[PDB]
Chain A
Amino acid sequence: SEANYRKDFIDTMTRELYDAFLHERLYLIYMDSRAELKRNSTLKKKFFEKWQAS
């Protein structure tokens, strides 16, 4: 009972810590992903416009 309360707190906090770690990792990968797409878009734009005006 005292041991039940300890377990439930640990189970609840394990789940919470995991959801945060995972969210932080998704956030970081996402940032990178946006950085890559931004760069790609910029290149397409530059050389598409250069082409069209050629």
Chain B
Amino acid sequence: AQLKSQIQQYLVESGNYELISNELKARLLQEGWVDKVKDLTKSEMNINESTNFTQILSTVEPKALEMVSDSTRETVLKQIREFLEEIVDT
């Protein structure tokens, strides 16, 4: 509950938030995902009446997440797990 706040607050101050975040983005760029999100956003705007920032995001989000490769998912998951392991008491 509140140990999570302590872990998430340590996450940022250690700089490990930024390491993981940067690894996630490098890998997402490398596999083409940035262009896929862009296509998904563009495509979803022609199919829709709405310009609404939040509304279009909520249609793009589910579809975008399924396009993330198992390799990127597994490598970042593994990286976060190893950081948690080193921090959560014995």
A1-39: CB near B (< 8 Å → 1, else 0) gives: 000001001110111011001111111011011101100
19 A-B pairs besides A18-B80, A30-B41, A34-B41 with CB distance below 8 A are: A9-B88, A10-B84, A10-B88, A13-B4, A14-B77, A15-B77, A17-B11, A25-B21, A25-B28, A26-B37, A26-B64, A26-B65, A29-B34, A29-B37, A29-B38, A30-B60, A33-B41, A33-B42, A34-B56
A14 touches B37 (CB 8 A): no
Number of interface residues of B (CB under 8 A): 31
Query: Could you tell me the dominant secondary structure of chain B's interface residues?
Result: helix
B76 touches A13 (CB 8 A): no
A-B contact count (CB 8 A): 63
**Whole-angstrom CA separation of A13 from B81 in the bound complex:** 8
Provide 18 A-B residue pairs closer than 8 Å at the C-beta atoms, listed in order of the A residue. Answer: A6-B88, A9-B88, A10-B88, A13-B84, A14-B77, A14-B80, A17-B8, A17-B80, A18-B80, A22-B24, A22-B65, A23-B61, A25-B21, A25-B24, A26-B37, A30-B37, A32-B38, A33-B42
